[PDB]
Structures are given as C-alpha cells and as structure tokens.
Write an enzyme that holds these catalytic residues in place. Sequence first.
Site, PDB file in Angstrom:
ATOM      1  CG  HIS B  72      -2.053  -1.009   1.093  1.00  0.00           C
ATOM      2  ND1 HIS B  72      -3.263  -0.863   1.728  1.00  0.00           N
ATOM      3  CD2 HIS B  72      -2.128  -2.176   0.408  1.00  0.00           C
ATOM      4  CE1 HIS B  72      -4.042  -1.891   1.438  1.00  0.00           C
ATOM      5  NE2 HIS B  72      -3.377  -2.702   0.640  1.00  0.00           N
ATOM      6  CE1 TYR B 201      -5.228   3.602   9.143  1.00  0.00           C
ATOM      7  CE2 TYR B 201      -5.850   3.303  11.441  1.00  0.00           C
ATOM      8  CZ  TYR B 201      -5.025   3.001  10.378  1.00  0.00           C
ATOM      9  OH  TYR B 201      -3.995   2.104  10.556  1.00  0.00           O
ATOM     10  N   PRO B 293      -3.904  -0.506  18.855  1.00  0.00           N
ATOM     11  CG  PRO B 293      -5.130  -2.436  18.571  1.00  0.00           C
ATOM     12  CD  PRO B 293      -5.007  -1.241  19.478  1.00  0.00           C
ATOM     13  CE  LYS B 297       4.108   2.808  13.638  1.00  0.00           C
ATOM     14  NZ  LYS B 297       5.444   3.146  13.095  1.00  0.00           N
ATOM     15  CE1 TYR B 385      -1.037   3.692   9.846  1.00  0.00           C
ATOM     16  CE2 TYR B 385      -0.043   2.836   7.823  1.00  0.00           C
ATOM     17  CZ  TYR B 385      -1.036   2.795   8.789  1.00  0.00           C
ATOM     18  OH  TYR B 385      -2.043   1.885   8.673  1.00  0.00           O
TER      19      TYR B 385
HETATM   20  C1  LIG Z   1      -6.803  -5.861  17.210  1.00  0.00           C
HETATM   21  C2  LIG Z   1      -5.265  -5.971  16.969  1.00  0.00           C
HETATM   22  C3  LIG Z   1      -4.723  -5.470  15.829  1.00  0.00           C
HETATM   23  C4  LIG Z   1      -3.357  -5.437  15.589  1.00  0.00           C
HETATM   24  N1  LIG Z   1      -3.015  -4.930  14.409  1.00  0.00           N
HETATM   25  C5  LIG Z   1      -1.671  -4.883  14.197  1.00  0.00           C
HETATM   26  C6  LIG Z   1      -1.210  -4.382  12.883  1.00  0.00           C
HETATM   27  O1  LIG Z   1      -1.874  -4.241  11.830  1.00  0.00           O
HETATM   28  N2  LIG Z   1       0.203  -4.229  12.795  1.00  0.00           N
HETATM   29  C7  LIG Z   1       1.127  -4.512  13.802  1.00  0.00           C
HETATM   30  O2  LIG Z   1       2.327  -4.192  13.773  1.00  0.00           O
HETATM   31  N3  LIG Z   1       0.637  -5.014  14.968  1.00  0.00           N
HETATM   32  C8  LIG Z   1      -0.700  -5.191  15.144  1.00  0.00           C
HETATM   33  N4  LIG Z   1      -1.150  -5.902  16.272  1.00  0.00           N
HETATM   34  C9  LIG Z   1      -0.231  -6.214  17.357  1.00  0.00           C
HETATM   35  C10 LIG Z   1       0.370  -7.605  17.164  1.00  0.00           C
HETATM   36  O3  LIG Z   1      -0.669  -8.569  16.907  1.00  0.00           O
HETATM   37  C11 LIG Z   1       1.146  -8.021  18.362  1.00  0.00           C
HETATM   38  O4  LIG Z   1       2.046  -6.976  18.771  1.00  0.00           O
HETATM   39  C12 LIG Z   1       1.838  -9.424  18.277  1.00  0.00           C
HETATM   40  O5  LIG Z   1       0.865 -10.492  18.339  1.00  0.00           O
HETATM   41  C13 LIG Z   1       2.986  -9.649  19.279  1.00  0.00           C
HETATM   42  O6  LIG Z   1       3.586 -10.917  19.017  1.00  0.00           O
HETATM   43  P1  LIG Z   1       4.368 -11.655  20.120  1.00  0.00           P
HETATM   44  O7  LIG Z   1       4.989 -12.855  19.543  1.00  0.00           O
HETATM   45  O8  LIG Z   1       5.215 -10.704  20.844  1.00  0.00           O
HETATM   46  O9  LIG Z   1       3.274 -12.154  21.144  1.00  0.00           O
HETATM   47  P2  LIG Z   1       1.942 -13.032  20.937  1.00  0.00           P
HETATM   48  O10 LIG Z   1       1.402 -12.992  19.589  1.00  0.00           O
HETATM   49  O11 LIG Z   1       1.056 -12.716  22.059  1.00  0.00           O
HETATM   50  O12 LIG Z   1       2.416 -14.514  21.147  1.00  0.00           O
HETATM   51  C14 LIG Z   1       2.951 -14.870  22.396  1.00  0.00           C
HETATM   52  C15 LIG Z   1       2.905 -16.362  22.560  1.00  0.00           C
HETATM   53  O13 LIG Z   1       3.463 -16.742  23.808  1.00  0.00           O
HETATM   54  C16 LIG Z   1       2.635 -17.773  24.311  1.00  0.00           C
HETATM   55  N5  LIG Z   1       2.652 -17.894  25.754  1.00  0.00           N
HETATM   56  C17 LIG Z   1       2.047 -17.091  26.650  1.00  0.00           C
HETATM   57  N6  LIG Z   1       2.293 -17.416  27.895  1.00  0.00           N
HETATM   58  C18 LIG Z   1       3.112 -18.505  27.816  1.00  0.00           C
HETATM   59  C19 LIG Z   1       3.723 -19.266  28.801  1.00  0.00           C
HETATM   60  N7  LIG Z   1       3.477 -19.002  30.080  1.00  0.00           N
HETATM   61  N8  LIG Z   1       4.531 -20.278  28.402  1.00  0.00           N
HETATM   62  C20 LIG Z   1       4.701 -20.501  27.116  1.00  0.00           C
HETATM   63  N9  LIG Z   1       4.155 -19.836  26.107  1.00  0.00           N
HETATM   64  C21 LIG Z   1       3.359 -18.831  26.525  1.00  0.00           C
HETATM   65  C22 LIG Z   1       1.260 -17.530  23.827  1.00  0.00           C
HETATM   66  O14 LIG Z   1       0.497 -18.718  23.909  1.00  0.00           O
HETATM   67  C23 LIG Z   1       1.478 -16.952  22.435  1.00  0.00           C
HETATM   68  O15 LIG Z   1       1.541 -17.927  21.381  1.00  0.00           O
HETATM   69  C24 LIG Z   1      -2.508  -5.942  16.551  1.00  0.00           C
HETATM   70  C25 LIG Z   1      -3.041  -6.475  17.745  1.00  0.00           C
HETATM   71  C26 LIG Z   1      -4.392  -6.497  17.955  1.00  0.00           C
HETATM   72  C27 LIG Z   1      -4.954  -7.154  19.201  1.00  0.00           C
HETATM   73 BR   LIG Z   2      -0.845  -2.546  16.870  1.00  0.00          BR
HETATM   74 BR   LIG Z   3       8.523   3.372  14.607  1.00  0.00          BR
END
Ligand SMILES: Cc1cc2nc3c(=O)[nH]c(=O)nc-3n(C[C@H](O)[C@H](O)[C@H](O)COP(=O)(O)OP(=O)(O)OC[C@H]3O[C@@H](n4cnc5c(N)ncnc54)[C@H](O)[C@@H]3O)c2cc1C
Ligand SMILES: [Br-]
Ligand SMILES: [Br-]
EC number: 1.14.13.2
Lengths: 394, 394
Positions: B72, B201, B293, B297, B385
């Site tokens: 995009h 948005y 969200p 980021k 952005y």
């Molecule tokens: C509505 C929404 C929209 C979003 N839109 C965007 C977007 O367009 N762009 C963007 O940059 N970001 C966006 N995000 C943010 C993004 O989804 C997250 O920042 C991302 O999921 C972070 O990934 P992570 O691996 O750090 O953690 P997570 O995805 O939370 O994964 C963590 C993992 O650790 C595991 N875990 C937890 N506790 C334990 C434990 N005790 N022992 C072992 N395993 C465990 C979980 O089961 C999970 O699989 C959005 C989030 C939301 C909710």
């Molecule tokens: Br986000």
């Molecule tokens: Br940034």
Amino acid sequence: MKTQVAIIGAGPSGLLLGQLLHKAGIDNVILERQTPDYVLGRIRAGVLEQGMVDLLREAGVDRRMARDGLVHEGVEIAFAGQRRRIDLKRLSGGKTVTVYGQTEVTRDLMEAREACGATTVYQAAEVRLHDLQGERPYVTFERDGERLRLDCDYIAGCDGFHGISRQSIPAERLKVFERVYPFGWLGLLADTPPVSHELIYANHPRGFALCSQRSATRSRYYVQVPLSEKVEDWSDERFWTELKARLPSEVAEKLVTGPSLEKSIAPLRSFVVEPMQHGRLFLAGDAAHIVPPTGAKGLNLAASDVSTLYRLLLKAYREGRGELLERYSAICLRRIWKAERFSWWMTSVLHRFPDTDAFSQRIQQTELEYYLGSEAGLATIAENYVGLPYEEIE
Amino acid sequence: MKTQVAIIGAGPSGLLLGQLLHKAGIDNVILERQTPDYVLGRIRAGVLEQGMVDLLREAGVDRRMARDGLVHEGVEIAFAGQRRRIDLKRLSGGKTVTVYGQTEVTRDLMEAREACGATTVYQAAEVRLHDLQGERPYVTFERDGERLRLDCDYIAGCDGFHGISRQSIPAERLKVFERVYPFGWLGLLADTPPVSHELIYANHPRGFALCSQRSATRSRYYVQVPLSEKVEDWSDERFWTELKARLPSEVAEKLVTGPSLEKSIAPLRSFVVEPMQHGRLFLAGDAAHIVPPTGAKGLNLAASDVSTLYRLLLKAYREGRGELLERYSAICLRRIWKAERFSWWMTSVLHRFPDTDAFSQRIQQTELEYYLGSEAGLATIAENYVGLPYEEIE
Ligand SMILES: Cc1cc2nc3c(=O)[nH]c(=O)nc-3n(C[C@H](O)[C@H](O)[C@H](O)COP(=O)(O)OP(=O)(O)OC[C@H]3O[C@@H](n4cnc5c(N)ncnc54)[C@H](O)[C@@H]3O)c2cc1C
Ligand SMILES: [Br-]
Ligand SMILES: [Br-]
Ligand SMILES: Cc1cc2nc3c(=O)[nH]c(=O)nc-3n(C[C@H](O)[C@H](O)[C@H](O)COP(=O)(O)OP(=O)(O)OC[C@H]3O[C@@H](n4cnc5c(N)ncnc54)[C@H](O)[C@@H]3O)c2cc1C
Ligand SMILES: [Br-]
Ligand SMILES: [Br-]
Ligand SMILES: [Br-]
Ligand SMILES: [Br-]
C-alpha cells in the site's frame, strides 16, 4: 455625535483598526475606559509575526519598529538537560519573527493617531451599546458626568477579555469554548542585558521558564507558578534564584540579574466564542478569543482579525459590498482555531502539570524528543510559530 | 536437555527470533503453552512495515508474502464529512507498508521451522524460569505429566502480555508505564471484497471505524465500542448497520457485507516496562510493551526488538562480545517510546472519548484539519506510519 465606525477600546486592536480605517478615509471614533498612561503601562507582548509587522507598515507606523525591533531567526527549547535550536527561517521557508514590545507598538499608534487628529475619547465611562440589529446602532458613554450619544454605522469591539462588547451579545446567540490551566506565568521586566540572543523556552521538572527580551538592555523573564501565588510573595531575589534553578547551568552562569521594573502574574487560558459578530457589532482581538502566551499568538491573532475587518469594511464603504461582512466570523475562526491548537500544544509540552501520571510524563518528554529531532516535526513548530498565512477573502 | 537460547512463546516474536538464530548457527528451543492450531487461530495484525518485511526476507521466509502480500502506498482518514489521503510513499521519501495477515506470517514461520528441524515444544505446561542471574539459567516445564528441565545460556521471553517471563523479574527492578483506554475495538473478519483499495480510518461522532483488508477477497473491519460490550450482543447485521453509519455515504453504498468468519473485542492499552531485561532474561514484543492498534505498530515493534536481540546475540556468540547485551534495553526503548507516542496520538485524534468538553472536541477536529492540510503535518504522520529507522547498534 456621529461617525462611521465606533471602536470600543484603545489597546493595540482598536488603535490599529482605527489607523488603517482613517488612512482609507473611513471616519472612526475610539472610546477607551482608562487613561492613555494606564494603557501604556501594560507590559505584554514581545514577539510579533511577519503579518503583524506588514500590517504596521501598511498603517504607516513602522519607522520606530524598523529601527529598534530585533529580528529573530530562531528560538531555543531546553528540556532534560539539552538545548535544541529551531531554525525558524530555514524551516519556515524564510520567515522570521520580530521582538518589539507591545508598549512600543501602542505608543507608536497613539502618536500616529494624535497627529492625524482622529477622535479618541479616554475615560469614556460606562460604555453601553444599543440597536445592534438596527440600521443605525449607537453607543452611549459618560464623560465627566454627562451621558453622551454617539451614532454610527458599525461598532468594532476591541475592548479585550473584560470588555462590554462581548457581554452585549444575547448569551443564547454564542457558543463559548474555554479551558483554564492550573497555573500562571510570573513575569519580571528588568533593565539588564538578555542572557541569550534568541529566546529560550525551558521545560524543567520544577516548572516552565522562559528567557525573553525587549532590547539589547532590557529583558523579560517568566516562570511557571501555581494559581495560589501572590506577586508580593516573590521578591526580586526569590525570582532570580527560582529562574536560575530552572535553566541549564551554562545559561544560569552568564545570567545578569537586576531590580525589577515590573513584576506580575498572568493566568493561562484558552477561550474562543462563535460567532464573532452580532448584527452591526464585530469582535476583534482579546474580546473574541484568548490564547495561553506559550505560542506568542494573542496580539498576532488580533492583527489578523483587524486586517480582515478593515478589508471587509473597505469593501462595504468603497464598493457598496456590505454583504461581505457576514463572512467575517467564518474567515477569522479558521485562523483562530489553528493558532489555539498550536498554543495549546506548546503549553502542554513545556509546562509541568500537577495531576500527571508516569505514562503522561514520558509521553511529554517523547513529544519533545520527536518534534525536536525530526525535520518534519521541526517544520510543524516553525511554520506555526512564524504564523500561518492570512486568508485573502472572497 | 540443553540448548543455547531458550525461547518462551511461539507467536511471531519467538518464531522469528528462533529462525534468525537457527540460520546463523545458534541453537535454540521454543516452548509454547498452547497448540499449533490455537496460535494459528489468532486474527491480529494486517499491516507490516518495511523493516518487518526485510527481516522476514533475512530469515528466508518471504516467498508467500512477496507473492500474496498487498503493498500500500497510502491510507485515508475520514472526519467531519471529508476523506483525506496521506500519500505515504511520497511523504516518507519512498517507503510503503505491506498488508499480509499475522496468521499468514505465523504459518510461514512455523512451516520454515519444522522443515529445518529446530526444536519446538507445544503444550509446554507451567513454564518456570530459574537462576536468571547465574551463569547457567534454566527453564522447567511439564510435558504430559513429567517435569522436564532445559538448560541454556540465555532466555528470550516472547510470551506476550500475559506471559510468565515478565512476571519472573523481581517487581522492584521494574518501572511500569501504563494507560488503559475507556474503549475497545470490535473487529469482524469477512470473506468479502474490501470497500477500498487502501485502508480508511474514520473519526465519526458515533465513534471510530476502520476499513481494512487481508486480500482481494477478505476484509477486516473494526468499530470503536465501550468496555461494557459483550461480543454476543453484536450480531453480524448489527455490526454492518453500525459500520455503515460511521462511514461517509459514498463508501457505505458500495460496501459488500457478509457473514463473519471471526468476531472479537480487543481492549485498547499502552504499556511499557523499563528495563526490558534481567540478568540472562531478555523481553521482546508484547511481553515488554503494548500499543493501542490505531498506529499498526505492535508486531512491527516486536520485529525491531527481535532484530536487536538477534544482532546482539550474534555478537555474543560469534565474536565473544557478550558485554554488548547490556545495551539491549537502551536501544529498544528509544524506538518503543516514539512508536508509543505515535500510537497514542493517532488514538486520541481518531476516537470519541466519553468525558469530553467542547474545547477538547474542537481541538481534536483542529488537530486533524491541521495535520491533514499541512505538508509538514502530513509528513509527521507518514514517516511514523511507515516506521522510523532501526538503530544500527554500537
Ligand atoms: C486488534 C489488533 C490489531 C493489531 N493490528 C496490528 C497491525 O496491523 N500491525 C502490527 O504491527 N501489529 C498489530 N497488532 C499487534 C500484534 O498482533 C502483536 O504486537 C503481536 O501479536 C505480538 O507478538 P508476540 O509474539 O510478541 O506475542 P503473541 O502474539 O502474544 O504470542 C505470544 C505467545 O506466547 C505464548 N505464551 C504465553 N504465555 C506462555 C507461557 N506461560 N509459556 C509458554 N508460552 C506462553 C502464547 O500462547 C502466544 O503464542 C494488533 C493487535 C491487535 C490485538
Ligand atoms: Br498494533
Ligand atoms: Br517506529
Ligand atoms: C503574559 C502575556 C504575554 C503575551 N505575549 C504575547 C506575545 O509575545 N505575542 C503576541 O502575539 N501576543 C502576546 N500577548 C497577547 C497580547 O498582549 C494580547 O492578545 C493583546 O493585548 C490584545 O489586544 P487588544 O487590543 O485586543 O486588547 P487589550 O490589550 O486588552 O486592550 C483592550 C482595551 O479595551 C479597553 N476597555 C476594556 N473595557 C472597556 C470598556 N468597557 N469600554 C471601553 N474601553 C474598554 C481596555 O481598557 C484596553 O485598553 C501576551 C499577553 C500576555 C498577558
Ligand atoms: Br511590552
Ligand atoms: Br500570547
Ligand atoms: Br497562525
Ligand atoms: Br490475521
């Protein structure tokens, strides 16, 4: 008594409007509540935008300013132990600001008006406005006991925040937007050379501080202070000690202090009324809106209201286009809101607020780090600080 | 059981870190609490920054994304009955963002890890961390009843907001910064073609709405909703009716609706912990910080934490420069705070807050009018952005 435009208030707004009008052949009378000396005693603005400077030249009252005013090309902002300079001239595409005291501007206009022989009634007591929606409005006032009547076509309320003109509009016809800040500015004017060649805005944990100037030998300093403070609690030395504590060490070291010529506390406020007119009454300057001093916009916004009012009145009188006067508010408010937004932003990032949590304190610091470190961020500050362009009308 | 780096969490952070590490010859084991299918069922991110895209290419897992992801060049913001496009590519100096679902990214990494034969233990129950400050830390977990021990050199907590790693750091060693917003996002995934080719948005008096997408035939929509709401109170039709009401008429008219594939409410929050490490434990992603969200980021910040952690671990293992790992937090936090500031700003200007006075509503509208109408303002949105540059280290 009869005139074309009655002007309430002989502060900078009323005086500038009357001068522009007189030069164009539109007769006007100014009514002021105080004495010439009282108005002159008000220490206020120090920073003027290019638009205000050009308007003063148009009114033919810029000789002294061109000679004595200081042209600044940048300003400094200090926070978290670092000083960052914003190159206004570079980032705004060549615009600058001019430091020339409001008492000076006022003196220049007053001298100019007296020489032209235009009518000014000082100590006009109990001014009242009548028939605002009629074809022939009028003003009544008292000069040494006798109530006199002044007939006019239009009335320009340039009487400031506590004037009578805004109170003269039926309350139901107005929408008021207001924010009162939980702090004020303690200012001190001294006959000492400024600590810097450019202004320094400082965000310090103890509170906001600002180093400004009036000339090569006169300085103006401010420190943020809570609303509970009384000016008598602040001796000159307490002020200097407090000021020094809020500035970076290398700045406080070369600071030349001295006895105060003037000392006062100004409360901070944002205020806007919509619309800015009612019938044949038009509000301009502080009578219609107030901005916290952080962005140096107040007097500059008054200049654009006046510039707009003058141009529309010219059209009305010289071209018979009286219908254009209905656009006054729409035109002014576009500029007023953007300046209000800028002043509010500057205020929120430079002052220390009382009920602030850890997240907010960090966001405040980050706002500064981002805007002062990004070329795009710096440009948003600079273009707003030098003043956004005036709308041409029609 | 022994490895070099133990990774808690098989979400995108843990998987990306493990892939980069494996490719460079640093053995690592990932422990996940849930099943592969559960992780895969999470509908989250849709927007990826250039930095995330390049990191995926470095990890050699970009084939599918390069083929299926949508690039995009702009985004739209609608407010007060007008739609304004921000040309990201033009205003950022050529950068763009890529739309590719988080479930996809995760699938790609999971497939890549399985083929390489790197160790992943799903359903690792009751993970506990021990000897974080020793020379030889270890992790204990339960696989079908028996408690197993995994020895390692370093532990990377990539377990998200509710993980065990952040809880494993003595509370007194951490400073928490948090803001909880009085609203959440009700999202709906549908197998319908998106209403626009670029995201929209929308700030509407009834509340925020966002039109996003996953592909040419799959859309993702969100509407702001108060915290009292339960997802069961929102039928598919109630959602569409509400969505349509918050969009400009010409957009709502061409909207193709359909049955939901997924529907859920996400609460909005800002959260940051300092530092992001403790002894041989390093936090990354949602385990260390959360952003609302609005700025897209979250996942992108996780990528930079991971990029930073990977590079430092490489230095430590390949070059014997273990001392560099102490700079992890300082490095990450600089970027985290700026992204937190951007997300907070986007959130405050696009959502409708409950306890808002007239002045604030006007300032909100003016913020939009100013930033969307100024070239400098547009550039501050655009550069943030698309994502600010990663710090190179050392
Ligand atoms: C509505 C929404 C929209 C979003 N839109 C965007 C977007 O367009 N762009 C963007 O940059 N970001 C966006 N995000 C943010 C993004 O989804 C997250 O920042 C991302 O999921 C972070 O990934 P992570 O691996 O750090 O953690 P997570 O995805 O939370 O994964 C963590 C993992 O650790 C595991 N875990 C937890 N506790 C334990 C434990 N005790 N022992 C072992 N395993 C465990 C979980 O089961 C999970 O699989 C959005 C989030 C939301 C909710
Ligand atoms: Br986000
Ligand atoms: Br940034
Ligand atoms: C601390 C401080 C710093 C500032 N710094 C700056 C700066 O650097 N740059 C800038 O742009 N602005 C600045 N200003 C703002 C600027 O001073 C004002 O916006 C400006 O004074 C407005 O001028 P005015 O003519 O509209 O009203 P005023 O200056 O208030 O004058 C109005 C006049 O109307 C008169 N009057 C009132 N009531 C009546 C009545 N009932 N009948 C008749 N006459 C009446 C008053 O006596 C007064 O003379 C600052 C203000 C403060 C307080
Ligand atoms: Br002055
Ligand atoms: Br001001
Ligand atoms: Br302006
Ligand atoms: Br997804």
